[PDB]
Amino acid sequence: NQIEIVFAAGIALFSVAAAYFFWAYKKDFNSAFLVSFITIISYILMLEGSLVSAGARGGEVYATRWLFYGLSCSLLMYEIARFLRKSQSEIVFLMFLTVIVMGTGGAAAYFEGWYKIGFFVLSSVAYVLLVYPLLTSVSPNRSAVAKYILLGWTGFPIAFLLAPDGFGIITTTTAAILYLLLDIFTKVIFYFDLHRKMEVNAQKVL
Amino acid sequence: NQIEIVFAAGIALFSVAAAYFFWAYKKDFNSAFLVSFITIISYILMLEGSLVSAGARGGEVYATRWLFYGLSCSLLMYEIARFLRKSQSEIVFLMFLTVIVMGTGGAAAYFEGWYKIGFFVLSSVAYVLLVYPLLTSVSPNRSAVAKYILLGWTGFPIAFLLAPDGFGIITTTTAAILYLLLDIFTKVIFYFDLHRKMEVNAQKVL
Amino acid sequence: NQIEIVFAAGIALFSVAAAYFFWAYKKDFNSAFLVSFITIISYILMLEGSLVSAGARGGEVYATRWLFYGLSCSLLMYEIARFLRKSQSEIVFLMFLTVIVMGTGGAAAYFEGWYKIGFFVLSSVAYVLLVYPLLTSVSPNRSAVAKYILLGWTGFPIAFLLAPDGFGIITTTTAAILYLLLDIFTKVIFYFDLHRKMEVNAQKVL
Numbered sequence: 001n002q003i004e005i006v007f008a009a010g011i012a013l014f015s016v017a018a019a020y021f022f023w024a025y026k027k028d029f030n031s032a033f034l035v036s037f038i039t040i041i042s043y044i045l046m047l048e049g050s051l052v053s054a055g056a057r058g059g060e061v062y063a064t065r066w067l068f069y070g071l072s073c074s075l076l077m078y079e080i081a082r083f084l085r086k087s088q089s090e091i092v093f094l095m096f097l098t099v100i101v102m103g104t105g106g107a108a109a110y111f112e113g114w115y116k117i118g119f120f121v122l123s124s125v126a127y128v129l130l131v132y133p134l135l136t137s138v139s140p141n142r143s144a145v146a147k148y149i150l151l152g153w154t155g156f157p158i159a160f161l162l163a164p165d166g167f168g169i170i171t172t173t174t175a176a177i178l179y180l181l182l183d184i185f186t187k188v189i190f191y192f193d194l195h196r197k198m199e200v201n202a203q204k205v206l
Numbered sequence: 207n208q209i210e211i212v213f214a215a216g217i218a219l220f221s222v223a224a225a226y227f228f229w230a231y232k233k234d235f236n237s238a239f240l241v242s243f244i245t246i247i248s249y250i251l252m253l254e255g256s257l258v259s260a261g262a263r264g265g266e267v268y269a270t271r272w273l274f275y276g277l278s279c280s281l282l283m284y285e286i287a288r289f290l291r292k293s294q295s296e297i298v299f300l301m302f303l304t305v306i307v308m309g310t311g312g313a314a315a316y317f318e319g320w321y322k323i324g325f326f327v328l329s330s331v332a333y334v335l336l337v338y339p340l341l342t343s344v345s346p347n348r349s350a351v352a353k354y355i356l357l358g359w360t361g362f363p364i365a366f367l368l369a370p371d372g373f374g375i376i377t378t379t380t381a382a383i384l385y386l387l388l389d390i391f392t393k394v395i396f397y398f399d400l401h402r403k404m405e406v407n408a409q410k411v412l
Numbered sequence: 413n414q415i416e417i418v419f420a421a422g423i424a425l426f427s428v429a430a431a432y433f434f435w436a437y438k439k440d441f442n443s444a445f446l447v448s449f450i451t452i453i454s455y456i457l458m459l460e461g462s463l464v465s466a467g468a469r470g471g472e473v474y475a476t477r478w479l480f481y482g483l484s485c486s487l488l489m490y491e492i493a494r495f496l497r498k499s500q501s502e503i504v505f506l507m508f509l510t511v512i513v514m515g516t517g518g519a520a521a522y523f524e525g526w527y528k529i530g531f532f533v534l535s536s537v538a539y540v541l542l543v544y545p546l547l548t549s550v551s552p553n554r555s556a557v558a559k560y561i562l563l564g565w566t567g568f569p570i571a572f573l574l575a576p577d578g579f580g581i582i583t584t585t586t587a588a589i590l591y592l593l594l595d596i597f598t599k600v601i602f603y604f605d606l607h608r609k610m611e612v613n614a615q616k617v618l
């Protein structure tokens with residue numbers, strides 16, 4: 001129905017994003033390229049539709065989006081935590097909480113009843129412990145990254161609760177469109193805005 | 207039947223353990239918190255029961271316990287190997303053997319016939335090569351960690367063979383109770399006993 | 413039929429290879445041992461046959477071979493990239509492209525229609541970006557590794573297209589035999605030829 005158009009739009013946008021990020025940025029470790037490329041793979045699988053599950057109020061759930069975030073958001077968390085000049089051990093810790101948040105989030109979306117509630121509570125506890133050291137960072141770059149944590153990262157659990165993954169108050173297509181806007185904001189706009197600042201900060205403490 | 211009570215007990219204990227370890231320990235990389243948190247996730251999945259398989263002598267197998275160990279026991283092996291002051295390259299090697307041991311162990315538990323035997327032999331070869339450099343460590347902390355390798359880590363393959371994962375000589379609930387006691391010993395008591403020693407050793411070679 | 417003999421041959425050869433590599437090489441991080449050991453696990457699963465899927469022209473596909481390559485070829489890429497003295501950040505980048513190439517390759521093999529084509533194109537783009545920095549390396553070891561990239565690594569996508577994973581022009585058993593020869597060349601002969609050179613190069617920039 002309309003959902004294939006949402007997924008097809010995500011494949012095209014992140015294919016353009018991955019192509020730009022590779023050519024425009026330095027030919028070395030390119031997190032921006034890897035994040036968009038992983039997202040392309042995730043949208044193709046969601047478009048194939050073999051991994052769709054029943055959601056709330058007659059909606060559907062694509063829990064593999066949450067599993068692919070664990071790989072792509074750990075790369076984002078690496079850039080974010082390094083931008084705030086967290087210690088190496090704190091970076092490793094935050095990247096683990098991110099994998100935990102997405103992993104339990106996919107389980108919360110796929111399962112039902114008290115298991116959806118329990119996995120959501122666990123994922124939100126790990127999320128609270130993930131963003132607390134970032135929102136209270138003494139770094140001067142803290143305000144520059146709070147816009148992406150508060151608007152983008154925290155928009156997903158809210159979308160989750162409204163989507164068929166949670167209470168199913170919005171339909172599956174509306175959730176996919178809102179997920180896509182959140183993806184563009186946290187994966188593409190995030191680099192258009194902060195790449196050079198992150199690049200300069202990284203050539204000074206490495 | 208009685209097994210849900212065993213899994214519910216594990217969820218409550220490791221939720222208390224994860225809560226204590228986070229608040230009591232330093233607000234940086236907390237392996238003790240991550241190990242217990244991962245174990246909570248594993249026990250909820252086992253309690254949901256969608257990933258249960260037929261075992262030996264009419265028992266059942268929860269092979270995802272073994273897959274989740276590959277993530278949580280690699281964190282334990284990191285602390286153990288660093289405590290014995292293994293080289294960084296030896297630490298990376300041991301963490302790989304741990305993932306191999308748990309991964310092949312989950313396959314041994316899930317499959318039957320000569321494949322259970324073959325996967326068990328492979329997992330035990332990798333296990334022998336994993337613990338040999340630890341039991342013969344020249345570190346003075348070697349005796350302090352041998353109690354957990356011999357009593358706790360080596361108790362799992364013995365429990366495996368008795369459980370429905372192996373010959374099914376004990377029932378599924380008895381195996382779950384014995385697994386839970388082994389979990390508490392190797393994941394919780396391990397830190398009550400060795401945290402400060404490991405913390406002091408780590409602030410001296412890092 | 414004949415395919416079990418191909419898989420049984422792979423189990424025996426890599427069991428001999430893993431046994432030799434462990435005993436002959438230094439008792440520290442042994443990539444050669446880990447690569448062969450992982451390959452043993454992969455061939456046993458393929459021999460068990462629960463993860464076989466329908467292929468092209470009545471052939472079959474064992475897509476888990478491609479998923480296990482993502483773990484074992486990242487170890488090979490680590491040795492290759494370190495041998496060419498790539499920077500640490502470039503090594504991490506190449507190991508990610510390898511996981512992407514194998515991951516999308518398993519999806520290309522498992523799915524059909526435009527999804528097989530799309531996943532193949534994505535996997536080949538990531539493959540082109542993976543081998544370009546290696547084939548144009550200014551390292552003097554570049555020619556010593558180009559034989560394995562061109563003959564061995566690039567033989568897999570060609571075999572893929574001929575195998576039931578692609579167009580199904582060759583049968584499943586012929587593909588398995590050709591996969592096995594490629595495995596022996598890139599995983600075993602690769603170390604018989606380059607171990608000491610790689611060992612000496614590694615004791616000079618570490």
Ligand SMILES: *C/C=C(C)/C=C/C=C(C)/C=C/C1=C(C)CCCC1(C)C
Nearest residue numbers: 073105123124127153156157160186
């Ligand atoms: C590119 C994708 C990004 C940055 C996604 C971030 C996603 C989250 C922070 C999701 C968080 C969730 C919770 C906070 C708990 C409930 C379930 C989740 C996974 C939606």
Ligand SMILES: *C/C=C(C)/C=C/C=C(C)/C=C/C1=C(C)CCCC1(C)C
Nearest residue numbers: 279311329330333359362363366392
């Ligand atoms: C928190 C969990 C820990 C420390 C678990 C350790 C588990 C093992 C060492 C399991 C070992 C096994 C073998 C030695 C081979 C047979 C199968 C296994 C996986 C049970």
Ligand SMILES: *C/C=C(C)/C=C/C=C(C)/C=C/C1=C(C)CCCC1(C)C
Nearest residue numbers: 485517535536539565568569572598
């Ligand atoms: C031990 C195994 C090795 C070194 C395997 C390497 C495999 C590849 C480079 C496979 C590449 C593929 C492509 C280039 C795209 C099409 C699908 C693949 C996965 C076969």
Ligand SMILES: CCCCCCCCCCCC
Nearest residue numbers: 029070071074075078501504
């Ligand atoms: C210098 C760049 C290092 C980047 C390391 C990122 C590691 C990502 C691991 C994600 C595991 C899910």
Ligand SMILES: CCCCCCCCCCCC
Nearest residue numbers: 063099100103104106107110
């Ligand atoms: C489509 C099925 C998704 C179920 C989620 C799997 C559970 C992953 C937990 C990861 C915890 C680190």
Ligand SMILES: CCCCCCCCCCCC
Nearest residue numbers: 114115118119121122221250
């Ligand atoms: C029908 C039984 C449902 C059990 C739900 C598990 C609750 C997990 C809570 C995790 C947070 C402590």
Ligand SMILES: CCCCCCCCCCCC
Nearest residue numbers: 002173174175177178179181
């Ligand atoms: C015809 C359906 C359109 C639904 C679009 C939902 C997009 C939500 C955007 C929320 C703005 C922050």
Ligand SMILES: CCCCCCCCCCCC
Nearest residue numbers: 089092235276277280281284
């Ligand atoms: C300083 C703390 C570093 C801890 C690194 C642990 C990495 C765990 C990887 C487990 C992979 C299964």
Ligand SMILES: CCCCCCCCCCCC
Nearest residue numbers: 269305306309310312313316
């Ligand atoms: C529930 C199915 C469990 C089967 C085990 C999967 C095989 C994992 C092998 C990992 C080797 C590193």
Ligand SMILES: CCCCCCCCCCCC
Nearest residue numbers: 320321324325327328427456
């Ligand atoms: C029916 C055929 C069963 C084949 C069992 C595989 C044996 C694997 C042995 C691994 C250790 C060398």
Ligand SMILES: CCCCCCCCCCCC
Nearest residue numbers: 208379380381383384385387
């Ligand atoms: C009523 C069933 C109780 C079974 C409890 C088994 C616990 C085994 C403990 C072994 C002590 C080391």
Ligand SMILES: CCCCCCCCCCCC
Nearest residue numbers: 295298441482483486487490
């Ligand atoms: C000194 C040896 C370090 C080897 C690091 C290899 C890491 C492999 C990760 C593969 C992830 C799929």
Ligand SMILES: CCCCCCCCCCCC
Nearest residue numbers: 475511512515516518519522
């Ligand atoms: C047997 C099913 C194989 C399907 C392939 C799974 C997709 C893995 C994508 C990994 C991308 C990093």
Ligand SMILES: CCCCCCCCCCCC
Nearest residue numbers: 015044526527530531533534
């Ligand atoms: C840009 C490369 C990825 C192209 C993915 C194509 C997806 C196929 C859609 C098939 C619709 C029936």
Ligand SMILES: CCCCCCCCCCCC
Nearest residue numbers: 414585586587589590591593
């Ligand atoms: C009886 C079937 C034998 C098929 C063997 C195929 C092996 C292909 C080798 C290609 C040489 C590079």
Ligand SMILES: CCCCCC
Nearest residue numbers: 045051064067068071
């Ligand atoms: C088929 C689901 C794959 C998810 C890998 C993160």
